[PDB]
Design an enzyme around this catalytic site. Sequence first.
Site, PDB file in Angstrom:
ATOM      1  N   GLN A 142       0.815  -1.241   0.000  1.00 60.80           N
ATOM      2  CA  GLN A 142       0.000   0.000   0.000  1.00 60.80           C
ATOM      3  C   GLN A 142       0.828   1.261   0.000  1.00 60.80           C
ATOM      4  O   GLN A 142       0.337   2.333  -0.345  1.00 60.80           O
ATOM      5  CB  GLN A 142      -0.914   0.040   1.206  1.00 60.80           C
ATOM      6  CG  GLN A 142      -0.236   0.151   2.519  1.00 60.80           C
ATOM      7  CD  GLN A 142      -1.258  -0.006   3.649  1.00 60.80           C
ATOM      8  OE1 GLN A 142      -1.884   1.114   4.061  1.00 60.80           O
ATOM      9  NE2 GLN A 142      -1.512  -1.120   4.109  1.00 60.80           N
ATOM     10  N   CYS A 145      -5.204   0.311   3.307  1.00 62.00           N
ATOM     11  CA  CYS A 145      -5.173  -1.092   3.687  1.00 62.00           C
ATOM     12  C   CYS A 145      -6.547  -1.685   3.476  1.00 62.00           C
ATOM     13  O   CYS A 145      -6.647  -2.806   2.980  1.00 62.00           O
ATOM     14  CB  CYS A 145      -4.746  -1.294   5.128  1.00 62.00           C
ATOM     15  SG  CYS A 145      -5.960  -0.558   6.198  1.00 62.00           S
ATOM     16  N   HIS A 166      -6.096  -1.403  11.533  1.00 62.97           N
ATOM     17  CA  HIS A 166      -5.474  -1.918  10.328  1.00 62.97           C
ATOM     18  C   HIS A 166      -6.287  -3.053   9.780  1.00 62.97           C
ATOM     19  O   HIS A 166      -6.632  -3.914  10.513  1.00 62.97           O
ATOM     20  CB  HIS A 166      -4.013  -2.355  10.561  1.00 62.97           C
ATOM     21  CG  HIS A 166      -3.269  -2.594   9.279  1.00 62.97           C
ATOM     22  ND1 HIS A 166      -2.880  -1.572   8.437  1.00 62.97           N
ATOM     23  CD2 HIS A 166      -2.852  -3.738   8.686  1.00 62.97           C
ATOM     24  CE1 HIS A 166      -2.292  -2.073   7.368  1.00 62.97           C
ATOM     25  NE2 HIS A 166      -2.249  -3.388   7.499  1.00 62.97           N
ATOM     26  N   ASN A 193      -1.071  -9.410   4.750  1.00 61.11           N
ATOM     27  CA  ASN A 193      -0.971  -7.975   4.926  1.00 61.11           C
ATOM     28  C   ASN A 193      -0.609  -7.328   3.598  1.00 61.11           C
ATOM     29  O   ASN A 193      -0.454  -7.997   2.584  1.00 61.11           O
ATOM     30  CB  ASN A 193       0.120  -7.703   5.939  1.00 61.11           C
ATOM     31  CG  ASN A 193       0.049  -6.333   6.532  1.00 61.11           C
ATOM     32  OD1 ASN A 193      -0.772  -5.498   6.137  1.00 61.11           O
ATOM     33  ND2 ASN A 193       0.920  -6.081   7.492  1.00 61.11           N
TER      34      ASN A 193
END
Length: 213
Positions: free
Chosen positions: A17, A23, A160, A180
């Site tokens: 990102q 995110c 997150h 992630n």
Amino acid sequence: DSVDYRKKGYVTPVKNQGQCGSCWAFSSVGALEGQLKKKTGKLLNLSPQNLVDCVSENDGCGGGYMTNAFQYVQKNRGIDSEDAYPYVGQEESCMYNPTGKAAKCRGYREIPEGNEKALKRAVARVGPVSVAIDASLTSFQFYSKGVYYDESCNSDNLNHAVLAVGYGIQKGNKHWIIKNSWGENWGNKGYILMARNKNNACGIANLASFPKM
Ligand SMILES: *C(#N)N([C])[N]C(=O)OC([C])([C])[C]
């Protein structure tokens, strides 16, 4: 009792990102992409910029909800692919084009807040699910190997969004397989195993949802 959609072909490469707070856009595309493989037998990289730029209900690079994002794709009658609307790293004028359409969405399903059991069923019977977490701890930043657990993880400090592409058991410790979006160098090839059935550690099950493609 286990699954890793990474071997299943349900997951695309790990993205970065960069310095945009999108995110939530990666989280949603992952889920959409998992559901694409699931339904048609193949996938591709979907467009988070399309989400950064077009999800008015979200805050672009300043944060946002995947629920809003799934709803957008549905209402919008689709979302583009990575190629058609490329990640640039910053919010811009929505540039959506129906010619890029590469996934559809016709609603979504939130997991009952905090119920890890139900998240384990959604991952099983559905696929890679969008979740959110407390990722503000240093321990998380330097995560490298093993099963991440830290007592200072606050399940009420959600900040997150990530992706649960599986769950298993390592050396006696139960886990969530989390993709992630900080690049493939971060963590372990861009992944982190986060404690499961440990009192909803880091709030892994407080904000979980998935699209109905
Ligand atoms: C990412 N990057 N964003 C900034 N985080 C985020 O949106 O977290 C919530 C709002 C909990 C989804």
